[PDB]
Structure formats: C-alpha cells, structure tokens
Symmetry: D2
Subunit: 506 residues, 4 copies
C-alpha cells in the first residue's frame, strides 16, 4: 500500500484506509523545504543565543533561562519519560497506526521545528508495522498517549509486532532503527497535539458511518417484511422540507428499495394503513443523523491535517509563538455530536424491531415465529435490543461540557475530547447489536412471506445473512445467531449496498 | 415594518428581526398560484368523490371512509379543540409571533391545501399584534402548541393584545376578523408542523449568538485586565490549524484588541509568563463554539422555511402523500448542539473570572479589591458564576436521544425537540450571568490600572458598563451591580462591537 | 399557629407545616442557656485579647490580626453586603419562611456565638409574615441567599409583606424592629450554613411525597378502569421479596383497592390475561421510589436540625474550631436521590396512560372516546404526558457530581446542592402533569363501565375530579381539563386517601 | 470454604466472600421442607388437572391451555434456549459464581416450585468451580443472563473450568453431573429473577467500599503531606451536624491520624492558614458518600435474599400467583445511588492531588519534585487524575430513569438495572486510578519532609507503597508507578487500615 504523503492533505477516505489496514507511506519531496526550514529557524535561535520559550529554555523557574545545551537534550528525554503517565488498556494496533500517521502528517507540515529524521523514524515504524504501546486513558485533550508512543523512539516503553509485545530496542531493530536522542523543541513537538483525540473520534466517525449504511439496508428490509409503503421516500416530500441529510437519506432508500418489488406488488390494494413513524420517518430521523455525522466529519477532517503542537515555528518570519492549538475542544464537540447520531440510529432501529414483534402491527406471527404457544421466537432478542438502545442514552451525555484545572491553574480549561471520542466505540457496539437483531428479524419476517422476493440490493442483504444464519423454524439457542449477525455487520457486509458519495469517508 | 413575503425565503437575519420586534407582513403575489392550486387539488378530489386520507376521510375506523362533507367540517374543529391539550406557562408574545410567522411561511409554500384566506387571517393577527395563548409544554416534536394558536382562528382560546388577555372573539375583532370555519385538510395543515420546535431552537440560537458576541468583548477586556498577550490571536496560528470557527474567532479578537493598547504598551518587557488556557485558548474554545452554532443555524435556517405538515398536496401531479416531515429530529439535534456552545462559552468565561480573583495569576489585588483584609470584593460574585456555569453541565444532557411511543404505537418514535430547544433559554440565562460578572470584573481590574486605556472597541465596552455600574471602591450590596450588567447584555449592549458577517443571523 | 421551638428537634411533619403555611414561633426557655453561653465565650475571647479566626480577626492578610473592635463591627456589614451577590427570580414567601425558620433553628442550638436578640429579630420577621427578598441562584452549597435574607436585619435589601415589596426599614417596622448592628462572628453565623440548600430539597421532598400519594390513587383507578387484577398486591409476594418500600406500597394499594369492588366483581371469569408491568409491578416500582424518598428524608430531616455554620463555638470547652459543616454534599445527594423517585413515578404513570389508550390493552374504546372515527379523545393528552415524562430523564442528571473551585482555590470542592434541589420542583411539575392526565383518563374509562363503582376511597378520587371536570362525551377544548386536574393535585386533593404513617412527613 | 446455607440469610460480608473467592456450600436441612413442598404443590396442580399459568400452561395463545405433559417438558428447554439471547463479553468467574449462589439462595427459599435436585446441580457446579458462560449484556432487569447460565444444566452452552472453556457436557462431568431435563415451572424459576442485576450492583458496592477505605488512608496522608490540621475531624463538629455518615467518617480519620504525629508536631505555631475544603470537608463529603453507599447496601442486602422469580408458589395456601418481583427497579436505583459515591470520592481526591501540585498551597516543591526547572515531576500524573475524575461525571447519568416497552407492550416498564450496575465497575476503575495517584503523591510529599513520620497506620500505608514504588528523585517513566499503585489498591492493600464495622460488608 503506497502512500506518498503531501502533509496536510489527507482525505477522510484515506483516513478510513489507514484505520482499517496497514500502510506504506513516504513523504512527498515537496514536504522537505518547510520541514528543514523550521529546524534551521530553531538552529538559528540557538546559534544566536536567542532565548525562546519551549525552544531552548527550561521550565517554570527557568522558562526564560537558556538552559545549557547539555541539559537541553536531557530535558527532552525527561519530558517524554515524565509525560508517559497514561493508564488503562492498550490501544489496538489499528488505532495506534492512525495516531502515528496523524502525528507524522502534522509534524511534516513544517511548523514544528523537528528534524525530518525523527519524522522518518515514525514513518519507519509505521512501514514496519511496529506499534508502540499506548494506554487508553489519561489525556484531557494528548500529552500522555503521545508521550507513550514517543518512548519507543528513545528506546523506552514497548511496542507490538505480529501481535506480540517487543522491547523498544527489539522493536526499533525490526524497523531498522536505533534509539534516538531528541533535540530542542522536539520533546514538545512530539508530545503536544490532538492526534489521539482526533484518532478516537475518527474511529467513532467511521463506526457511525458503517452503522448508517447498515441501517438503511436493515430499515429497507423491515419496511418490506411488514408490507410498508414506499411513499414516505418520495423525493417531493424531502425536497419540500429542504433538509439535505434527509434528502440524501431518502435517495438512498429509493435506490435500495426501488419503485416496487415482488413483495410489495403482491400486497395489492389496502395501502389504507399509514405506516408507523419508525418506518415512515426514516428519512427525517436518519437524515438528521446523516447531517450530524457530516458536521463532525468536517471538523475531524480538518483536524486530521491540523498543525496542533505548541509553540509554533514560523521560519518564514523567524518567529516562534505560543498558542492554544493543542486544545481539542472542536474534537470534543464533534464526538459529542457523533454520540447523538449513533444513539438515534439505534433507537429508531429498536422501535422497528419492536414493531416487528407486534402482530397487530407487523402482519406477521407474534415474535416472528410459527406456533408461539410453545415458541418464544424473537421475544428475548427484542429485549436485548432494548437493553442496548437504552444504554446509549446515558452514554450520550456530553463530555465536552466538563473541565478540570491542571498544571497548577495554568491549564485551567481543557476539552475532555479523548473521553468524548472513546465512548463512541461502545455506543457503536450497542447500535451494532441492535441492527444485527433488526437484520435477523426482517429476514425472518420476509422468510414467512413464502417465496416472495424484495429488491435487488435487499435480496443481497438477505443472502448475506442467510449464508451464516438459518431461518428461525422453532426455538433454538438464540445468542449464536446474534453473534453471527454482529460479526457480519462489523465486517462491513452491508456497507457496499449504499450508493457512492453519501458518507464523508466513503 | 413592511415584510413582503416570498414563502420559503426567510433569512436568519429576518428571523432574528421577527423574533425581536413586531412585524408587518404581506404575501408576495407570486405566492398565490401554488397556494390556490393545492386548494383546487383538494377541491377536485372532493368533487370527484375520490377518497384521500387526511383530506376527506375520518380517522382510524374511518381512515378510508369518505366522511360526509358535514362531518368533515366539524371534524376540523374537533381536531383543533381536542388537540389543544398543552400545559405550562404561556409563551411570550415574541415567541408566539415567530411561531405564527413560521406557520404562515410554511403554509404559503402551496403544499398544504389550505385556503389563502386562512393564511390571511394569521397574517391579520400578526399585523394587529394579537398573539394567541400558547402554553409552553406538551409537544414531543407540534400538535398541541399549534392547536392552541389555531383556537383563536375559530373563536376559541384567548389572545394577548397590548399585554392584556382578550377573548378570541374580542381578539379577532381587533384584527378585523370574524371566527372562521375550517375546510378539508385545514385542521391538519394548521396542527401538523415543526414551527414551535423550530421557534424554540431559533431563540436559543439568537441567544447563543448574543452571548458569543458578548464573550469576545468580555474576554478581550479580561486579557487586558491581567496584562495578557495578543500573541495567541496571531492569524498564523489559526490558519495552521485550519478550523474555520477558530480562524473567524481569532479575527474577531484581533479586531477588538488591535495590535497594542496603552495598557499593553505600558506592560513593557516581561512577556515571560505564558497566559493560562482560559485566555490563550479563547480562539480554539470559542471557535469550536462558533462552528457548533453555525451547524445548528444551517439546520434551523432550512427548517424555518420547511414544508412541515402532513399529508402533502402535490397539485402539479395531482398526488397527495403522507410522509414524516412533521418529525422534528433535526431541530432536536440542532438544539442539543447549541447546548454545548452555550455551556462552553460560560465555562471558559467562569475560568477567566476565577483567574481574575487569583492575585498569583491576575497581577491584581485578590478578588479585585483594595484592602481585602476587611473587604471581600468580587469573591462571592465569582461563586455565583461558578454556580451558574455548573448548572449548564446537567442542562447539556441531550433531549434528542429520548423518545416515547404515542398514538397507540403509531407514533412510535418522536424527537423531543421542544424540550431540547427550551432548555437553551435557561442555559443562556446562566451564561449571561457568568459573562455579566466577567464584564464587571474586567472593568474593575482595568480600573485598578490607574488611568490606562485599552483598545477603541473595548473602551466602549467599559463605558457601556460604567454608565450603569461604578468602580468597586469598597464592599457594597453586590447583586444590584450584577443585575444591571445582565440587563445591559440582554439588551445587546456589546453585540454591536463584533465585526459584521461572523454570526449566522447578524 | 403556635410553635414553641426546642432547637434541633423539628420533625419532617413540622417542616411540611412551616413550608405550607405561616408560622408563629417562640424559642423554648431551655434554648437560652447554650445560646447565651456561646456569646459569652465570644465575649470572653475579645475581653481577653485572644485572637480567634472568624471571631475577632480580619480576613486573609488579617486572618491572624485582631482587627480593631471598630472595624470589627463594620466588617460584619461589609460581609453581608458583599456576600449578597445572588441573582435570578425571587423565592416565594413559603420557601423564604422555611429558610428563615431553618436558620433560627440552627443558630438557636447555641454553637454559633450569635446574640439571642438577633435570633429574636428573625423570629419577629417570621411571626410578622415579613419575608426578605432572596434570589433563586448563586449558592454552590449558602452565602448569597443567606446574605440576601440578612440584609433586611441591617435595614438593607427589601422584603415582601401581604404580597407587596417593602423597603427593609418599612419591613422592619411592620415586625416592630429597628435596623441592627452585627457583632463579632455574627456576620459569618448568619451567612454560613446549608439552610437554603436544605430548604430547596425539602420542598422537593414534600412534592415527591404528594406525588407518591397521588400515584397510588391514580394507579388504583387505572387498574380498575382496565379491569386489572388485585393479585399483584398480595402481601405474600411483597414479604417474599423483603423490600420494605414495596411492602408498604402494596399495603397502600390493598387499602385503597380492597379485596374486590362492584367493578372487579362484574368482570367475572377470565383472569386469563396477565396485566402488563405498568399495573402489575406498581408495588416494585413505586416501592423503590418510596425507599428512595425515605433515604433522602432521613438525610434532610437531620440536616434541617444541623449546626451548619463555621467556625463553631464550643463554650463548654472554651474552644472555637473551623470545620466544614457548611458543605452541603449530603443535601446534594439527597436531592439527586429524589430526582430518581419523581421521574420513575411519572414514567410508570405515563405507561399506564399509554395502556389506557390502547384498545388491545385497555378493554376500552381507543383513546377513551366514543365514536373515535371523528373524535380524537385523549390521544393528544397522552402525548403531553409523554413530553412531560421525557423531560424528567435529562432533568435526572445529578448535580452532586459537579464542582468548581472558588475563593481562589480555598473552596476547591463544593456541593452544587442548591441546583440539585431546585430542579426537583420542575420535575415535580412534570410528574404532576402526567398524573393529572392519568387521573382524568382513569375516571373517563371507569365512566365507560356504565354505572359501575370502584372501591370506597377510589370513588372519592372520582368524585373529587368530577366536581371540576366532566365526563369526556365528544371532542372539546382539552387543556382546561388538564389544568383543572393539575390544580386539584397541587392542592393535595388525593393525599388524604393514603394510609397514615407511610410517608416521612405525613 | 464450607458454607451451610440457610436460604434467605446471606449477609453482605458473606456476599463479599463469595464474590472474592471460591465457595463450598451445602443447603441447611431446614431448607428441604419448603423446597419440597412447593414442588408437591406444583405436582398436585398437575395431578388434579388444574390449570395454572406459568405452571402447566403454554404461552399467549395457550396461556390458559393445559399443554400436554410432553410438550410441557420440551417447553422448558425451548424457553431456556430461546431466552439465551445475550451478547457482549463473558462475565468473569467471580461474578458468575455470585449470580449462581444468588440463584441458589432464592430458589432454596421454597417459593419457586423447582426440584431440590436442580438446585443441587447448581450447587454442584459452584462446588466444582465450573462457571457457565454468561455474556455481559441483554437484560433490562434477568432472562438472558440467567438463561445462559441454565444452558449448562441442560448440556448446552459452555462453561469455564481452571480458566479454560469446556463444552457443557464436559463441564457437567467435572461436577459429577449429567444433563438434566426440566419440569413444569422450572424453566421460569431459573430464568425469572434479579440475580444478575443484583450481582452487578453488589460488585459495584464492594468496589465503592474498597475505595472509601482507601480514600480515608490517602486523604489522611495528603493532610499530613501539606501540614494540614486535625481540627476538622473534631468529634464535636460532626455531632453538632448530626449526619451519621460524616460522624463515622470523621471517627475513621481520627483513628488513622491520631491526636498528633512527628510530622504534625514539627509544624509548630502557624495554624493560621485554614485548610482548603478538599482536606477540611473530608468528613462532610466522604460522610455523604458513606451514607449513600449504606443506603444502597441495605437495598442490595435485602435483594440478595429476595424471592424474585414469577409466578410464586404458596404451598401453605395452595395458591400460585403472578406478581412483579422480577422487576429490578430498587436494584437500579441502588446502583445509580452508588454512582454518586464513587464519583465524589474520586472528585474530592483529585482536588487533593491538585492542591499538592500547587506550591502556594502545598508547602512543597511544585509538582512534588526537586529542581522542577528541568523536571516535570507529578504534573502529568495530575492530568491523568483529572481525566479519570472527569469521565465519572458523564458515567453518573442515571440508568434507572430509562425504560423501553418489550414483549409487545406486555412488559411496558423495565428497570435497566444491569446497565446501572455494570457502569459502576468502570467508575470504580477511574476513582481507583485517581486514588493511586493521590497515594503516590502524598508519600512523595511526606518523603520531602526529610526523616519525618506520620501516624502508625498511615506509616503502614507509606511502607505498603514504597515496597513497590520508590521516591521520585528526578523524571523517570511515570506510568509503571501508577500501574503499581493501582494494583496495590485493587488488592485491598489499604482496606485493612480502616476500623471495623464501618462499611456494610466489612
């Protein structure tokens, strides 16, 4: 997988690919100039015995003292060691790779005053598929997680390779590297930034997108299973409202559903029963979710390319300036935004499941099973979906509204973006479980409409499932079916049915 | 105030003006065609003894029965009467006017099959400044509140005029109207829609905008009061991150602050103390808030013009279709989105207040007062700001993630957009109180820098306050000062200092 | 209403009476000793030129300086003036009276070193029904609200009398008082404490209790209306679980319901349809709520009698000690606890309403109305109940988990108990609206069981309502009925049906 | 470990031991009578061709049909298979053992009509340390998780033994069992109940208790490290407030702290600086938490012994009754209650950490390190604690206030107690991380008071830590120290210092 990186130009689709699979990358030749020039600007400051905070000074007491060169170099190690104070579970390699590539992208923009050779080391680690240990918690939005990553550069910490933990030195050799020594500003360049926060929210974004796509397919099947109407998806309704998300959503439903199906055609005159909101307001509810994840994607798309460390080096003017780009407030809001979409996608789906369980609603046997006097059918699966949908409401509580003061009142407001981002992964597992159950139920219900077929793309969704899970004939161990369905969705089995260009990264 | 309405074209600035003050409006002649044509389409259906749900049928049992004309007409009254089941405090006239104008705008787009003369009645009521009673609660997202409004059309309910409650009939005469009788589909046309939800969120939007504007001015004063740096607002920092909200925010700070001030110039060499995040990350935090309220404004801007009732009449094709546009999910998310902005604006401000109270941070006397051994100064005001900032965290909990099934499982998923929107008004009162206190504190602190002036626009912010509230010389009754400051902000005293074209409706 | 107060012995029932109506109180003679002795201890310190913090010292810089007597006295006024920095709506007289009586109770315990004559002034104000202005917001848990109350003692602020605002001096004369001058420690004695926090939560408690009582009656009517069973309330079921709240709750249902009714008897054999959880799990759900409000009442009962100011005077030993009793953490948790009860009482009730709307569940006409083809009946009322029930979920978010640092890091953790307590009042208005609608619906449904009577106490609940609201014959303006029902409940119309000794204050 | 079980008499301490380690149990002979008698009552019903719902009937359609014996037996398997529809991670053996023992306890009370031999099988599995697979999610409060457990009884599912998954049949043989066939009511007896919900909250309870205990020790060390006063813990202060939790908490502090220490004695005259609230209000804040966890423990203690299935068999009277004991509302509230305690314990601790980082507060070097110009010391550890404390606020959102309708509107209100309980485990990991950091910091700070010793018990807390983690001399890899400290706490290293009889289960 060759990627030739033009720093600051990653697209959301590129980001999804980095997240999904190993990468091979190289910096574009056009990146060298600005990168080498911020180093030269740093080198000049030092050569001219100029004092610059965050460049050649010590801290606090020494924040204006030109720390001797000797202590300057060891100050970088001490920063990284002391800052590597994270805790909790190890991030998986996929997420570690994204963070590494985000850091490379940002440093490579030439505002950080870090040597190209350090950047090249990180790249060597990516290319070698050597992923430094990074613990899940600690950042308030990303000193700790970025400090854990950088440990390996110095020959400290540990890293994963071929799924086994290696010592840093062992790890470095795998990548054809030897331990490095950091120079002025490099410690800060590596530790300051929003790459972990951004990475966490991006994974939430990609999950949110996979689930949107799945939900269009499952909701289409459910519509068919209970003989719902295609009228709610009429373009005229959506154009008259003017909401773009909803207009795009409805277009997706029409594409998947078509004008009619054998199923729909064989439910002749009757269209006298208006469909419940969980079917009929799918464009409106799923469109709102689509708009919401597009808003987040835009913010996160920009942040993936942001120059986020501090202080910034402006070689062109000779200036070094301390600002607040390491504050990940926009990332935090984007994540809280995504929370709303993942929850409402799951909520609308659970009510569709609920409908399907109701023989007064479904025009199907109660709980989707033949001879329910002695068979419980899907009844407890529906309960599982309610439990999962429910959990998402509390999980929806925003993290972007909380802050505690740190660094002795000097970092008196922070974003809490890492917590905001990572709760999204569990919300997505809940909504994924809900959709898997909807998937199972709608194929069961369509099954009961003996011999009848739905549309072309929805029939592919039925075959996808039925190749792993059989029709529900009579009560049997239920959980393995749900497990199966969930893995299918997690593997993107239905994503490909959605039309192109709808979702930010797809 | 003449407004000649081209239906579906209201701008956010027009919406802010309708919200802020009485309107005089007239429909543009180009609206008549489509409006008269949906009526004609309805008239044709009835003339052809065609059955159409939501047009000439009864409900449930009779949902396919062509209800006799006679019962058809009385069905409209009964719908409005039975649907007027709202409760809680009366909306104020300002908000009632916005809802009325939103309903007019939507019906006037010609998809609702309602007579121009009914639309004209609502317009007559607006023009006459006769505002029907509408209670605050009941909608799940807006049958009840729109049904209360429509009562007056029929000569039921009551309405406010010159701030006094009048009977509907008295009210109607003030507007030069007599009670009307509704025709086929008119009841539904009036009661279905998202106008109240939209109106509630729009007020939240306009509040959020006023507060943003105030916060740029107050944060600029606070920066000056504690001798902060202008370096964090350097354009190069914000362009390097790429976030638009933050880029625009920083531009606002530079405009208000300028390159230097007498204050800043007289704090010679020293710039050795990095400013805390509550000053230095203002572009990043306030920019995130700006982006967030721009996302909401876009959704709400579109929704203000939406065709939101049901079923929709498509005269051009002869079709009538039932869809889900009355589902206000996008409005609900937009409001939850705005919640995040109002809270973080207040949180960042309270920490700026906090900083100002700390003589190790502020370079000012503790609690902003001379001889604090016996004077408490601003100490308890700061506590008030903490209480107000705090309340906003719980208030931030999203409403868009909750739903309960209604109408016997037929409306099985709803938005909860009215609750989402109205909590914003109280969040805004909290953040307004916080900013008022920041305002007071920064003018006090600048005062203590004897004779020194800040920038041109920030000096106007100081004079604005000082014309109502005097320097704090020694302990005195504090609450009246805060009261004063709050009313000043609520009157938009600082809004005008912000550069043009930054905020969606300004 | 004579109350002769033995300080520290108020009961919850006494507290409900103070809250509900004017009081006439006098201190018991046995209170004089300890009250006069803490003053004497303060007087001795001063007479012996001993330095005591919070007694005869100034603040911060002067926290160890024996401030001259002269400045000592003016320091008390300045504390009260500067601390009166609250904001928002005026508390109503009922709540102001409770706070005043709570302060009197606490000071009268003799640990505060305040003169009996100051205490007597507050008592004079209560007895005269002169209620100082106190604004709703500002405390983080209660300097501001207690400082506003004390203003009037000094002839500052304003007070309400016979529902009109009076100047403090006018107010004082009504009570036969002249402005006072405060002595050493008195300022702190008055301003420190948890009385407002406690008062806010107590009102929440009493509301929660009224609603519990109402819900037993309404749920009993609903059970009857849909021909539910009395079997779920069998004592054996509740004893076998062992939960006390549930055991007591079920006993209440049995008392109100009885072994059988004309209604229940006339629904002969059939008991083949198990009742839904919203009826059948009433003991379990309402019992949990009962336990929860009993836990809160215990904490609040104790806190109503707490010695809560600081520093405390221990005359017996001669010691003065600074502690943290003014921290209202337990009050904050008690309120968050009560939030759960008010929400679940309303949630269970709304589902009972929902059931009643469902002719497949209710054994009643859909939406409780004859000829629903053209009549909507209770359909939109149910929607109102869903909107109100829904709002309570977000409102349930705990305030006790938030804190911001105040007083320049010296009050670095606070309770947020006032916010916790006051949100309960609105939660209670929501649940009250829900129950009013249940009340209306169950009497309507029982009505439809022509001529049949329920039990003795539930028939009184029916007559209570029917004296204000008529049977629903056909569609009519709905909101006035709900308004009526709500006022009935707010007046305690159903409270008296509940057996004695169940609820903490009743 | 022999336990001879008297059903319904488990104590909280017994429950903590079952949770912590393997058990060996036997039913007391006095349990046989009522257990054999409910079976006989079931047998009599069947022998008399009496129809009883949930005993010898089929479901829904057949809810009044005496299902043939043959289908009766297979209905039990089908219930268990179809109900085993849970998902998510496998519970660990510890938690599976607790659930099994809770189920045994409840069935053994003789109200369930299940054969002693089935109960004996579960006991055989416990004794053999064979733990059936149970997935984490699915219950709405516990059909799915109890159905997964019961699978193994029938020779389905899988179970863990010596940490390896075994087939059910392999598992059964390890316990000396063969697959069973279930009889009338047994399926329901096994699947209905609140044992998983209760088990989840109990683990939360025990965690909350361990953390309370740790926090008293760490807060005592922090007090000493920054030369705080013992005056806030004076019994007179706590008795004067009257709050029991706080009185008990303060007694704990006095026990651990003592009247004085070498440390405290060597900080001679000065006691002129009042301690911040994070030290001084420890009795008030930790006491509130203690009260809160005592309230939960009481509910959970009772529920551990509850008869929770349905319908219940009352052999004494011959009656079988369907009720709602399987509704775990009280468990859900107890868990939400515990959430508040775990969060506030962590919040108060993080502010104590914060204080310790502030040389204007701590009387220690900034960030607890010598030569901080080039050493960052504990600065980023503090950030980690803020991130962890912060996460707990959103996690605090109550689950007991949410519900969705299941079983086609027949279970229209549910508790969401499993979600409520399990979020507590992660909240406890956050607060544990916070305390570990406090622990580290206070031992570091005391270290800096060269040669000085604190009290007897607090010196043991110092030695406990120092045996794993060395004094912080200069910057080094920080995270391993925190990891170490966390494992120490998780192992109960400080629990034993707390006085006996304070905590419900200890």
């Amino acid at each position: 997988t060759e990627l030739t990186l033009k720093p600051g130009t990653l697209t959301l689709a590129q980001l999804r690919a980095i997240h999904a699979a190993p990468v091979r990358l190289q910096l574009d030749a056009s990146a060298a100039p600005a990168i080498d020039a911020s180093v030269a600007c740093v080198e000049q400051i030092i050569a001219e015995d100029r004092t610059a905070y965050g460049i050649n000074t010590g801290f606090g007491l020494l924040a204006s003292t030109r720390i001797a060169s000797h202590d300057l170099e060891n100050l970088q190690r001490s920063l990284v060691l002391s800052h590597a104070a994270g805790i909790g579970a190890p991030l998986d390699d996929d997420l570690v790779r994204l963070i590494m590539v985000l850091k490379i992208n940002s440093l490579s923009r030439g505002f950080s005053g870090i040597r190209r050779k350090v950047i090249d080391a990180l790249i060597a680690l990516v290319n070698a598929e050597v992923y430094p240990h990074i613990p899940l918690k600690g950042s308030v939005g990303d000193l700790a997680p970025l400090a854990h990553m950088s440990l390996v550069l110095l020959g400290e910490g540990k890293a994963r390779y071929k799924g086994q933990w290696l010592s840093a030195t062992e790890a470095l050799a795998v990548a054809g590297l030897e331990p490095l020594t950091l120079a002025a500003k490099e410690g800060l360049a590596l530790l300051n930034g929003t790459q972990a926060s951004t990475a966490y929210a991006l994974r939430g974004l990609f999950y949110a997108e996979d689930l949107y796509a799945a939900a269009i397919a499952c909701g289409g099947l459910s519509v068919e299973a209970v003989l719902g109407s295609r009228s709610p998806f009429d373009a005229r309704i959506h154009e008259a409202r003017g909401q773009r998300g909803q207009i795009d959503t409805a277009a997706c439903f029409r594409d998947l559903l078509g004008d009619s199906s054998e199923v729909s055609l064989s439910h002749k005159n009757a269209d006298k029963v208006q469909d419940p909101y969980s079917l009929r307001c799918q464009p409106q509810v799923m469109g709102a979710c689509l708009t919401q994840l597009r808003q987040a994607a835009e913010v996160l798309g920009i942040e993936a390319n942001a120059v986020s460390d501090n202080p910034l080096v402006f070689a062109a003017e000779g200036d070094v300036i301390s600002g607040g780009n390491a504050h990940a407030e926009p990332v935090a809001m984007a994540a809280d935004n995504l929370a709303l979409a993942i929850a409402e996608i799951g909520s609308l789906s659970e009510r569709r499941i609920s409908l399907m369980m109701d023989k007064h609603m479904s025009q199907l046997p109660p709980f989707l099973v033949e001879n329910g006097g002695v068979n419980s059918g899907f009844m407890i699966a529906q309960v599982t979906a309610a439990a999962l949908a429910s959990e998402n409401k509390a999980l929806s509580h925003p993290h972007s509204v909380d802050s505690l003061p740190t660094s002795a009142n000097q970092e008196d407001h922070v974003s809490m973006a890492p917590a905001a981002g990572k709760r999204l992964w569990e919300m997505a597992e809940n909504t994924r479980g809900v959709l898997a159950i909807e998937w199972l139920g709608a194929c069961q219900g369509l099954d009961l409409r003996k011999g009848l077929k739905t549309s072309a793309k929805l029939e592919k969704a039925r075959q996808a499932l039925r190749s792993e899970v059989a029709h529900y004939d009579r009560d049997r161990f239920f959980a393995p079916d749900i497990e199966k369905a969930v893995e299918l969705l997690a593997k993107g089995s239905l994503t490909g049915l959605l039309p192109a260009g709808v979702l930010p990264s797809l």
